[PDB]
Design a protein around this ligand. Structure first.
Ligand SMILES: C[C@]12CC[C@@H](O)C[C@@H]1CC[C@@H]1[C@@H]2CC[C@]2(C)[C@@H](C(=O)CO)CC[C@@H]12
Ligand SMILES: C[C@]12CC[C@@H](O)C[C@@H]1CC[C@@H]1[C@@H]2CC[C@]2(C)[C@@H](C(=O)CO)CC[C@@H]12
Ligand SMILES: C[C@]12CC[C@@H](O)C[C@@H]1CC[C@@H]1[C@@H]2CC[C@]2(C)[C@@H](C(=O)CO)CC[C@@H]12
Ligand SMILES: CC(=O)N[C@@H]1[C@@H](O)[C@H](O)[C@@H](CO)O[C@H]1O
Ligand SMILES: CC(=O)N[C@@H]1[C@@H](O)[C@H](O)[C@@H](CO)O[C@H]1O
Ligand SMILES: CC(=O)N[C@@H]1[C@@H](O)[C@H](O)[C@@H](CO)O[C@H]1O
Ligand SMILES: CC(=O)N[C@@H]1[C@@H](O)[C@H](O)[C@@H](CO)O[C@H]1O
Ligand SMILES: CC(=O)N[C@@H]1[C@@H](O)[C@H](O)[C@@H](CO)O[C@H]1O
Ligand SMILES: CC(=O)N[C@@H]1[C@@H](O)[C@H](O)[C@@H](CO)O[C@H]1O
Ligand SMILES: CC(=O)N[C@@H]1[C@@H](O)[C@H](O)[C@@H](CO)O[C@H]1O
Ligand SMILES: CC(=O)N[C@@H]1[C@@H](O)[C@H](O)[C@@H](CO)O[C@H]1O
Ligand SMILES: CC(=O)N[C@@H]1[C@@H](O)[C@H](O)[C@@H](CO)O[C@H]1O
Ligand SMILES: CC(=O)N[C@@H]1[C@@H](O)[C@H](O)[C@@H](CO)O[C@H]1O
Ligand SMILES: CCCCCCCCCCCC
Ligand SMILES: CCCCCCCCCCCC
Ligand SMILES: CCCCCCCCCCCC
Ligand SMILES: CCCCCCCCCCCC
Ligand SMILES: CCCCCCCCCCCC
Ligand SMILES: CCCCCCCC
Ligand SMILES: CCCCCCCC
Ligand SMILES: CCCCCCCC
Ligand SMILES: CCCCCCCC
Ligand SMILES: CCCCCCCC
Ligand SMILES: NCc1cc(=O)[nH]o1
Ligand SMILES: NCc1cc(=O)[nH]o1
Ligand SMILES: NCc1cc(=O)[nH]o1
Ligand SMILES: NCc1cc(=O)[nH]o1
Ligand SMILES: NCc1cc(=O)[nH]o1
Ligand SMILES: CCCCCC
Ligand SMILES: CCCCCC
Ligand SMILES: CCCCCC
Ligand SMILES: CCCCCC
Ligand SMILES: CCCCCC
Lengths: 331, 331, 331, 331, 331
């Protein structure tokens, strides 16, 4: 055997009872799988690498080059115990074998790599939905060893993060990849060191505009055509107004089916409900005209009405002003 | 080897054949994942810690400080067998390794930690839905050892429970975390000791008001506009009343799709069905007026009707009185 | 070692080559999880206990009391091979360890306990849905040993079954827990002994009445208001009848979405389809009146119609008679 | 030890380097779980048995009777490697232990049994849906050994297949169970022997008739009532025709939601689309009558129409003739 | 033992510390399971084979023929570590045992086979939906060994890919199977060799035409019948136009439910929205005619209109011209 595995007890970390052993980390991101709004989490697949030195794995050689083993010797030597904080579920690929790489240098330097898929939670805000921007992060920490036994740091600082050129999302735009570092404290175990991977996401507005905003505007303009119809056709104008109200209500209900039960109103809800009020007022507009006409005929017994003439101009002006204000605030 | 594992039989608990061995528990709650109304359960992720003493794990040292091991030695020593009562499913994270911490003091004190995700059932009441308040609890108990072999208690009493500052729910408000203790009895095994973790939840009413209460009120007020229309436009008032009835029926059906099949009526159902009656009576109101007008014309052959004039005042008054009573009982 | 495990071959049952060894069973039911109508199965969680004697596990002592082991010694001794017949899926909880209890008396008596969750199929009949009553059972049998090698019986007869006081179902009522015993035969292995656990379930009718029966009745009574309207308002009565027909059709379609594709008609289907016929005949009623009026005017050229007057009384009488008969048969 | 397991190398099949060893198979079917139309597969649970002889397992005895072992000795002896061809997923039950039976005769005959649940794909044709008939089969084959090393055959020919009396499907009728045998060839490994289990399935038509065919016919007959209404009530006949068209379109859309995206038209689609044409032509029928009446009045200025009179007879006759032809082809 | 497994250390690859060891791959495709548009991935089941030589597995014989082992010896020898790049989930069938084949020649040649099901992502474009064509590929690569330690190549070049004759998709047409080879580079591990399997898919247009295109055209032609009706029947033409608009809106909404939220407009959306404009303009057409008639009567106070006469010809001509252009671009 090139390595004297049986001659050492690997139940203790290198430098047991002494100073902490530094550990390096390199991360390459492969792809992002899915994002859930109701569950507020994301899925990521990445390659995780570790760097440390152990004199117990030294072997004699003359070339001074790294040597690669099959990978099943990992379960017989000491390995760090990094874990993902605030994660919901994760696993390691095992086809056709465990995705494990083990390279040992003659002086004892060890390279360890893994391929994992991790799901982590992220707190999102939907105040500006669907024109919002979300930021999420991934955390890496050691579970068992504190800062007095193991020191965790990025292997090459800002250059330790790499991303595949094929990473893309159908509904989101990915940008601003960077890493940071911060300490963590637990009241009953001590202090630990954490590593962060940050990114930013931006939605695409084309789908929401075509599916929600355009149908809403068309329904509002449909109610305006009743002002150009003669008021004597009562069974012809009343159904027009009512059907528009019912259609607008159906549109509002269908939008909320794909969003969670938040406690605050979203930007899309404001636009839909304001449009509902405009259509509702249109129905009441004809009711006033009909009542006044009946009273006028009764008084006389014992042309275009003024309300209709002014409604032709006031209603389009108010809606256009609302759009200018609404789109200026939300850009 | 620092620990003489092979020199002892760890198939028996410490103090075998004698007095019970005390065990301490510390719990830190990380996050709450989801709540299901149809399944009546919740998901929680937390850190579980154990405290006990075993003289068989003593090792000589001079510093008198805790020493940390990699964690795979756990399967070779005695470990408590705590389990969650009334749970449906649960698992332990194993990425990149099992989330296990093992610290042994020179005198034999042992610290054991785990990271688990547990789903437990909770009996909820929906008599005041969606303005209800729910209380749920989590139970921890030893499966194999009774009170005569193992004693279970909180390590620091009221101070043994900690919660993360990031715990939040989109639809619920979390409050009132506390712990209690109670004994349990089984008819064929004996007595056991249980530990409890309690919390309270409160819903948010904004979503339900906007999605259900507001559309219901608007439909009811839509039927009131028919009283101001001339009764001679029969094909103009009948469609107005009928379409409101159909729309109200659609609203009622859609609400129940997200709730289980309970055997009692909820608060939201009362409001919706009362509104349905109001719209239904509105349709019958015009039928009486039309019939009386036809009879009056026939009698004469051989203005505003009195029913319409009184309906303009009675109907709004009754609905407002209902709202005052309904919102006073349910606050 | 207190037990001489290594001195015996546990690959053979006690009393190998001789008479059968009796085995006792005790069962305590914890909770019922869910019931599926489309899949026709139920999920149950329970505690399973076994009783037998093995002289190879005897150890010397003076107190003559049961001793409890950690539970990992089970995989080194002989254990029965009970399994659940007609089950679809099942598993054993393993958090934080396997829920296994092992107690051995000095004379060799052994107590073995497990905690499992089992899903078993049940053949249900929906002829009286939703006022039906269903009976299901759970079967326990030994897989490998016949009656000539292992005898299976209840430990205490009728007293071997216990149920938790917290067992409840939102939609069903649980009652009539009892156990029976019957033999089973296989054409190629021999005879076996089976154990049964039986229970009965009853649905709650409040949800079905409010969601289905009440809307159906209201729609039928809505068609009756057309008989009190003047027949000269043709565009006012025809839409009333047609909209009721379409609404009734929508109600019928939505009910079947939650039931499987059975080959027989259910009780709820009879009520809905009879109501559909009543509304359909109402539409045809006005068509006859309109045609006769046109013919009468044409004959004359060259008040209340008799059909309308009789329809006001005949239609309510027929529907009430149908309800009396329908509710008398199904109680 | 009764069996000299440690004295032989079980890494080689019996008769290594010589003639093939015959293997027998017995199969008993327990139940069928589910059938998926979109995924085109079925799930089956069955008992699998094997028969072979191995002189290395011989033990001395005088009774000459089969002896049963606990079953964990299987992993220490040679076992066939049968697998299911064209399967998607499968597993073996392991509660409370692996469902494994091992019986060895004194001369060396071995009986091996297993309990598995297998999902296998089946190619179905929906040209006659929902009045179609489907045939599916299950395949058993050895993965590692060819015909020159292992010979596979049915233990008792036609009598090797047994079925439980409780096998039933809610939507399908099961019949025609039989077994066949055929060889298989691979271009790079050689020849193999396969075993087949065949069965036939037939759907139930009651659900489809009541849910789809009856509503379609009623809508078609609803359009026929407009021919008996006076043509002067234009706003009374036009809504009747249009609402029937929209309702028919809704029925057609809902049916396809439960079927995959096939590239050929089904039997149910033909009936629905022909009915849609009949209703569509009814709307065009009144348009011609209205236009001709207006032209006739204009010409005159400068009773029952002939089209309506003929439509009362032609339309019912055509639909009845279509039903006779449609139901004669599909029986 | 025929193979001297215990006499070698299989933790190192053959030719350790020297030149790379060539590895051959053979692939036979069994079936394609499903394709998801929202998730943009596909599922494939295939047989994977490996070819290499290892002198440590040599055994003496005279026949010089391949010998087959049970397959559990794989976990005791060196095996390649191939994995699928850009995959989401995958597993290996294990019923009734692991689908593993191991054949070793006397000189040391080894044959290794597996049966796996792999889900891999594919980037699709929906600019021409539903008349689009998609291309997807599958990637195979070694995870641990670079090109300096292991060389990967196709065993027989273009002849190494085989497909089952039963491969079919209900909605897609499969064609153009071929394989390629390309190198891959990682910034922190080195260079690797990849293998590709490519295929092309084409949709079927029959379902989309019948379900979407035909209903859209019929609704457009329904609005054209209003031009042949007398303009004095105001309550008869206005409902016709409005109901067509609402029906067209319902059709548009239902189509997008089965597609993801892309940021570009599809071919089907263009056809639907253009038809919506045609129906919308039809409603405005009658409004102009009604207003002009009222003004003309008022001026006179103090036949067929010209707009209707021209609309009968202009509207059909424009729609036909649009269809010719639309179907010429998309073929
Ligand atoms: C506006 C509306 C709903 C819409 C119409 O029915 C009118 C009522 C009037 C009473 C309101 C109620 C919404 C909920 C309110 C604001 C209650 C709450 O603070 C809820 O916690 C107190 C009074 C309630
Ligand atoms: C109110 C309604 C349903 C709604 C209309 O069809 C009228 C019937 C009248 C008969 C009622 C029935 C509901 C169910 C009842 C109350 C039965 C039950 O105790 C059920 O266990 C006995 C009589 C039944
Ligand atoms: C009643 C209905 C459906 C509803 C209307 O379209 C009228 C047809 C008339 C012909 C019927 C058919 C239902 C299915 C029947 C009874 C067939 C079967 O035995 C089916 O196996 C033979 C004749 C068929
Ligand atoms: C790649 C690398 O670092 N190679 C060095 C080599 O240059 C040096 O001569 C040798 C002596 O130990 O150590 C190693
Ligand atoms: C985006 C980001 O955080 N970039 C940082 C940069 O600000 C810092 O100057 C550098 C050196 O530590 O590391 C990196
Ligand atoms: C942290 C702690 O408890 N340290 C004590 C130390 O103060 C004491 O001198 C020693 C003697 O055994 O035991 C240990
Ligand atoms: C919320 C709650 O139960 N708090 C209890 C408190 O009432 C009790 O006095 C204290 C000391 O045991 O423990 C804690
Ligand atoms: C609980 C029980 O059964 N205890 C008995 C004890 O009374 C008896 O004296 C002893 C002698 O072997 O056996 C044991
Ligand atoms: C509900 C039921 O079956 N109860 C039985 C009872 O009839 C029988 O008399 C008794 C004694 O065996 O066992 C129990
Ligand atoms: C069941 C059976 O086959 N029994 C036979 C027995 O009749 C025969 O005397 C014996 C001699 O070896 O072999 C065995
Ligand atoms: C349904 C079927 O295939 N039955 C066959 C039968 O035709 C054949 O004669 C018999 C003897 O081999 O085996 C069985
Ligand atoms: C199938 C095959 O390759 N057979 C050859 C055989 O022809 C040759 O005589 C032998 C000598 O080693 O090697 C082997
Ligand atoms: C479809 C395809 O790529 N076919 C290639 C072919 O072009 C090439 O000439 C041949 C020899 O390498 O391999 C194969
Ligand atoms: C009814 C359609 C109104 C369209 C109003 C256009 C508003 C443009 C906003 C531009 C903001 C910079
Ligand atoms: C139709 C709208 C009626 C609104 C009635 C307001 C009731 C306010 C309740 C306040 C309770 C304190
Ligand atoms: C239209 C409502 C009819 C209500 C008929 C009441 C029937 C009561 C049944 C009582 C059976 C004991
Ligand atoms: C509109 C209802 C038409 C019913 C036609 C009955 C056809 C019976 C087919 C019998 C075939 C043997
Ligand atoms: C309203 C129906 C218009 C039908 C137009 C037919 C267009 C045929 C396109 C042929 C392209 C080669
Ligand atoms: C909802 C009541 C409408 C009353 C309209 C009165 C117009 C003068
Ligand atoms: C449902 C019957 C309505 C009868 C109305 C009679 C008005 C006097
Ligand atoms: C469905 C045909 C209705 C015919 C009605 C005739 C009334 C005398
Ligand atoms: C769709 C055009 C209808 C034209 C009807 C003309 C009747 C003579
Ligand atoms: C001359 C026709 C005017 C129509 C105005 C329609 C406004 C949407
Ligand atoms: N490093 C995570 C952690 C939590 C704990 O209690 N101990 O370690
Ligand atoms: N501690 C739980 C339990 C149940 C049982 O039967 N034995 O232990
Ligand atoms: N005890 C169940 C069973 C079935 C079989 O074939 N052998 O045992
Ligand atoms: N017996 C199945 C099979 C396939 C193969 O390549 N080798 O064996
Ligand atoms: N061969 C895949 C891969 C990625 C990596 O980081 N090392 O290997
Ligand atoms: C809509 C406003 C009308 C005002 C008439 C004086
Ligand atoms: C709605 C009540 C009317 C009363 C007329 C006397
Ligand atoms: C509805 C029945 C009417 C009978 C007229 C003679
Ligand atoms: C529906 C056909 C009518 C023919 C009139 C001559
Ligand atoms: C629709 C165009 C009409 C033009 C009349 C001059």
């Amino acid at each position: 055997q090139l390595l004297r595995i049986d001659d050492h007890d690997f139940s203790m970390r290198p430098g047991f009872g002494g100073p902490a052993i530094p550990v390096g980390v390199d991360v390459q991101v492969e792809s992002l799988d899915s994002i859930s709004e109701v569950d507020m989490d994301f899925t990521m697949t990445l390659y995780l690498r570790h760097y440390w030195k152990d004199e117990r794995l030294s072997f004699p050689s003359t070339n001074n080059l790294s040597m690669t083993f099959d990978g099943r010797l990992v379960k017989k030597i000491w390995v760090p115990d990094m874990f993902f904080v605030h994660s919901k579920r994760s696993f390691i690929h095992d086809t056709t074998t465990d995705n494990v790489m083990l390279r040992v240098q003659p002086d004892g330097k060890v390279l360890y790599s893994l391929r994992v898929t991790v799901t982590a939670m992220c707190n999102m805000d939907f105040s500006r939905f669907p024109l919002d921007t979300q930021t999420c992060s991934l955390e890496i920490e050691s579970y068992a060893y504190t800062e007095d036994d193991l020191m965790l740091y990025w292997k090459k600082g800002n250059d330790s993060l790499k991303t595949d050129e094929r990473i893309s999302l159908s509904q989101f735009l990915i940008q601003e990849f960077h890493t940071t570092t911060k300490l963590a404290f637990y009241s009953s175990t001590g202090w630990y060191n954490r590593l962060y991977i940050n990114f930013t996401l931006r939605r695409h507005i084309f789908f929401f505009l075509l599916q929600t905003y355009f149908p809403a505007t068309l329904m509002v303009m449909l109610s305006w055509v009743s002002f150009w119809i003669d008021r004597r056709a009562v069974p012809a104008r009343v159904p027009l107004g009512i059907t528009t109200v019912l259609t607008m209500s159906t549109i509002i209900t269908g939008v909320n089916a794909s969003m969670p039960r938040v406690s605050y109103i979203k930007a899309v809800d404001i636009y839909l409900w304001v449009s509902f009020v405009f259509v509702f007022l249109s129905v009441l507009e004809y009711a006033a005209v009909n009542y006044l006409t009946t009273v006028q005929e009764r008084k006389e017994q014992k042309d275009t009405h003024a309300i209709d003439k002014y409604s032709r101009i006031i209603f389009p002006a108010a809606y256009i002003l609302f759009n200018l204000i609404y789109w200026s605030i939300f850009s």
